[PDB]
Write an enzyme that holds these catalytic residues in place. Structure first.
Site, mmCIF file in Angstrom:
data_model
loop_
_atom_site.group_PDB
_atom_site.id
_atom_site.type_symbol
_atom_site.label_atom_id
_atom_site.label_comp_id
_atom_site.label_asym_id
_atom_site.label_seq_id
_atom_site.Cartn_x
_atom_site.Cartn_y
_atom_site.Cartn_z
ATOM 1 C CB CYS A 166 -1.250 0.035 1.198
ATOM 2 S SG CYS A 166 -0.806 1.370 2.148
ATOM 3 C CB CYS A 223 17.181 -12.599 16.768
ATOM 4 S SG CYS A 223 18.411 -12.741 18.100
ATOM 5 C CB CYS A 249 15.617 -20.566 23.473
ATOM 6 S SG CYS A 249 13.712 -20.489 22.492
HETATM 7 ZN ZN ZN Z 1 -1.942 1.737 4.068
HETATM 8 ZN ZN ZN Z 2 13.765 -22.424 21.828
#
Ligand code: ZN
Ligand code: ZN
Ligand code: ZN
Ligand code: ZN
Ligand code: ZN
Ligand code: ZN
EC number: 2.3.2.31
Length: 414
Positions: free
Chosen positions: A176, A231, A246
């Protein structure tokens, strides 16, 4: 795909509203209310005026100031045909408060309101001071035009008044210049793996819950960690522990990327449990995607700073693409959780289980780079790392969806 603005639609609409005003002669404000009643099919309207009485057709569509009592120069009073004229500010105030809330019709009648003869559109446009609301009205009244018209769909963003026009409604991606991207048909952010029926099943279920992880505590040193990024490879800073784990599952790194570790995966309550699992990745990826949109801001500085020293614009532009791909793969991912939630355990479920776990680690390898590890590296070294990283990132997605596109060809699951 063609990208149009809000003004371009109102203006286009006005050429449509006006050209049909022969013979109606009723001003543009009326004609659209009529054209809405007959729902923007043109000929279907003109007919209903001719062969029978118009009265019924209308009925189906139906010194001081008088608000703040004060005397102003005559220039400060704008009137309607009704013969009432108030402050330019009293108008902007009666206007703005009436258009904002509550949910209203398409009209805005006279301010005295027993005088109800609707204020015509353009006179509402001149009169509203704040530009933000002028866009709301523009959207408000125009809504029928684009709703009643195929190939014209609003940008599904809260702040975006742009509208996409297509040749045919094929349910493909559209951008857009928002810069948001979305599924054409259903108007949700582009979901490649999933189906609109299945993806819309969640918006009812995600909304079903009445009860997004901002902070968490380290598994090793137990110290608290706030999520910034990006991340999910998490290095907690305390001299105690170098973990290195993690974010979504609090287990370590890097058995992530290893095959022995899956980050991916009375009976009444058994359902809400596996939902909390599957939704938590959907929610945590969205947050981890959000903080990636910041990178576009920094990448303009990264390229403007890099280019003046050494290389050429064509040479640097790969650095935006990394973020493009990263923002592409991050979107593709959280939607595979709509996919994976409903499809159950079948021999085709465990094959796509691997492509995702391969893609999951693909993102964290790139997203973890452009986050922190990038600024330390040399210019000659970084370009090679960014390249080979988002090359794999991009390849994975096509290989992931290679399956998914043939998985729905002959029914494998639900
Ligand atoms: Zn838009
Ligand atoms: Zn993981
Ligand atoms: Zn006044
Ligand atoms: Zn009046
Ligand atoms: Zn869709
Ligand atoms: Zn720690």
């Amino acid at each position: 795909y063609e990208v149009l603005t809000a003004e371009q639609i109102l203006q286009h609409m006005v050429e449509c509203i006006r050209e049909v005003n022969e013979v109606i002669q009723n001003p543009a404000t009326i004609t659209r209310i009529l054209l809405s009643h007959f729902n923007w099919d043109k000929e279907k309207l003109m007919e209903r005026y001719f062969d029978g009485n118009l009265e019924k057709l209308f009925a189906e569509c139906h010194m001081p100031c008088q608000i703040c009592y004060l005397n102003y120069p005559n220039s400060y009073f704008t009137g309607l045909e009704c013969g009432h004229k108030f402050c330019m500010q009293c108008w902007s105030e009666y206007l703005t408060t009436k258009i904002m809330e509550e949910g209203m019709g398409q009209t805005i009648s006279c301010p005295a309101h027993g005088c109800d003869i609707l204020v015509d559109d353009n006179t509402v446009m001149r009169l509203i001071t704040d530009s933000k609301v002028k866009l709301k009205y523009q959207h408000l009244i125009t809504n029928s035009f684009v709703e009643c018209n195929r190939l014209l769909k609003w940008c599904p963003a809260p702040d975006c008044h742009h509208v996409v026009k297509v040749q045919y409604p094929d349910a493909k991606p559209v951008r857009c210049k928002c810069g948001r991207q979305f599924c054409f048909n259903c108007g949700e952010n582009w979901h490649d793996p999933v189906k609109c029926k299945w993806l819309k099943k969640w918006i009812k279920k995600c909304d079903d819950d009445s009860e997004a992880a901002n902070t968490k505590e380290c598994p090793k040193c137990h110290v608290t960690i706030e999520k910034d990024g990006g991340c999910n490879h998490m290095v907690c800073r305390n001299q105690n522990c170098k973990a290195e784990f993690c974010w979504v599952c609090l287990g370590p790194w890097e058995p992530h990327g290893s095959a022995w570790y899956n980050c991916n995966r009375e009976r009444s309550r058994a359902a809400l449990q596996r939902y909390l699992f599957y939704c938590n990745r959907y929610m945590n990826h969205m947050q981890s995607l959000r903080f990636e949109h910041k990178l576009y801001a920094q990448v303009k500085q990264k390229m403007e700073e890099m280019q003046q020293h050494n290389m050429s614009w064509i040479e640097v532009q790969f650095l935006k693409k990394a973020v493009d791909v990263l923002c592409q793969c991050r979107a593709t991912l959280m939607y595979t959780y709509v996919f994976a939630f409903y499809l159950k355990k079948n021999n085709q479920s465990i094959i796509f289980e691997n492509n995702q776990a391969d893609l999951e680690n693909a993102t964290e390898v790139l997203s973890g780079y452009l986050e922190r590890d990038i600024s330390q590296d040399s210019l000659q070294d970084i370009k090679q790392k960014v390249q080979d990283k988002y090359r794999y990132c991009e390849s994975r997605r096509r290989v992931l969806l290679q399956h998914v596109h043939e998985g729905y060809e002959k029914d494998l699951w639900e």
